[PDB]
């Protein structure tokens, strides 16, 4: 048969050599072309164990995205370790592209085809793949953007749902569009996000139903972030190379018991940012002139459940979580594992 191994994977993409876009440039040197005819072999009478929380593929992807950001981003001032460095900071072309991770000779990638897979333990429908699907290395907090959807219903994933210190990764089964804009010409840093109120609330109702399976007959509440760095208290993301920080209170302010307008999120383009790649602070130049606009698909979310008792009881509170970018890579790499053919 096969044994679980930690092999050095290679990458493949549809990166364009003519592009000045940062992800395309990195992938032109680090990656090979995407397999025109990729072969998937569905395995009969095979049950294999997978563990998304202990997946070495996450670590390799994390290393690649850190290097991509480090060699691509141009901050005016960088503070690391008590020392500061000033350099030229021209604006860049930034838009993630899908990246495939491929197994070398003597190795294979096993894929979990169980539509309801929780993230750990056995899986009955397994297939051998040469490469993973195309993964966009999206650096965002609270909401997972431009990822893959759950095939059947919404899937709640946690290493242990009963442990409040463990992150909850929600995978949606239908995309929720998020339209973000910094209008053309007043306050150059003022921006906003639009989300269909009815679509988001119905999504929240279905997330509450899936959460209630682990918290029987309990009221499910969504509340705002309890605190932390601006990167995690707010929904943070990239759009046209600019760092957007959105107040997400309106997205997490509902109570769900056993039973078309827009949500306008107030946003700010920040210049002083706390780095995720390493411990430090980075400063960028003011935003570019004109309309800064991007549309993204919310395909998942990161939640933390409130610890301790409540005065009333019978109610569990969930708040947007984050802090570790490995959980964003984990949300896409959950169905794969590296195995040695030998």
């Amino acid at each position, epitope marked *: 048969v096969w044994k679980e191994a930690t092999a050095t994977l290679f990458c493949a993409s549809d990166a364009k050599a003519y592009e000045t876009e940062v992800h395309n440039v990195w992938a032109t040197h680090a990656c090979v072309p995407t397999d025109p005819n990729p072969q998937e072999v569905v395995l009969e009478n095979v049950t294999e164990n997978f563990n998304m*929380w*202990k997946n070495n593929m996450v*670590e390799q992807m994390h290393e690649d995205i850190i290097s991509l950001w480090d060699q691509s981003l141009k901050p005016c001032v960088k503070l690391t370790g*008590g020392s500061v460095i000033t350099q030229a900071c021209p604006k860049i072309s930034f838009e993630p592209i899908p990246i495939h991770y491929c197994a070398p000779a003597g190795f294979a990638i096993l894929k979990c085809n169980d539509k309801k897979f929780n993230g750990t333990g056995p899986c009955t429908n397994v297939s051998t793949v040469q490469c993973t699907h195309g993964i966009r290395p999206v650096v965002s907090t609270q909401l997972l953007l431009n990822g893959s959807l759950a095939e059947e219903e919404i899937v709640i994933r946690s290493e242990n749902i*009963k*442990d*409040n*210190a463990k992150i909850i990764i929600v995978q949606l089964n239908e995309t929720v569009e998020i339209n973000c804009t910094r209008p053309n010409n007043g306050d150059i840093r003022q921006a906003h996000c639009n989300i269909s109120k009815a679509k988001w609330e119905n999504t929240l109702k279905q997330i509450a139903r899936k959460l209630r399976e682990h918290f029987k007959n309990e009221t499910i509440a969504f509340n705002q972030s*309890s*605190g*932390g*760095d601006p*990167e*995690i208290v707010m929904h943070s993301f990239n759009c046209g190379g600019e760092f957007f920080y959105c107040n997400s209170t309106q997205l997490f302010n509902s109570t769900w018991t056993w039973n078309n307008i827009n949500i306008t999120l107030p946003c700010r383009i920040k210049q002083i940012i*706390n780095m995720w790649q390493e*411990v430090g602070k980075a400063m960028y130049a003011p935003p570019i002139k004109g309309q800064i606009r991007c549309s993204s698909n919310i395909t998942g979310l990161l939640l*933390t459940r*409130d*610890g*301790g*008792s*409540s*005065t009333n009881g019978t109610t569990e*509170t969930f708040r947007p*979580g*984050g*802090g*570790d970018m490995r959980d964003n890579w984990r949300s896409e790499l959950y169905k794969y594992k590296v195995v040695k053919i030998e």
Partner: antibody
Amino acid sequence: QVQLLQSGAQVKKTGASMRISCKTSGYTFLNCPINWVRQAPGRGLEWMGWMKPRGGAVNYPQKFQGRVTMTRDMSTDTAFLDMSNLRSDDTAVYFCARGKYCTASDYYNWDFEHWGRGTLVTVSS
Amino acid sequence: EIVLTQSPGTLSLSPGERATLSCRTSQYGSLAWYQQRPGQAPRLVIYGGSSRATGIPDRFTGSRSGADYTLTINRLEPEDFGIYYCQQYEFFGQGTKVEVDI
């Protein structure tokens, strides 16, 4: 050796605010959460919440929400606990605690093998 | 979310005797036992219901029988004097006092 060094005892007036610190060493501060556990005179142990040095993410029980703030200084590997509008009941020994199991990729928060000496806080008129 | 019921309130014994501490919980979660000596921080004794923590001698044992968890301290020493707490995640029992002296 994992070490949790807590700040000196404090004497506070009813209605005042406080700031307690916990300076860590012997491990990578970034790796796991810091917990705060209090003990009122002649009473049990009470968890006040956790704080993750990676991003400063927090988790507070309902009773401490709006009155407790847990933060950190990455440059000195120090965790801080802030508490507002102090009451006589808030008189307790405040401990910082860390779980036994902590690696660069995994941790279990709850098995508190590592504790600071505790910071006595006396609140009175 | 989890109430942990400790019994008895106080145990008054002599060195060399056996102490039997009880903790009741109807909930899932890895159970820990702590020893807290006067004026000191608590010390982890047992974790995962039955495993001994660093530097804990074999005379300290943890066991589980459904909702009933027990910490047994065989061959009691004067240094075993203190309050013992059980724990599941963020929840603690009210403690059991173990009185032992020279």
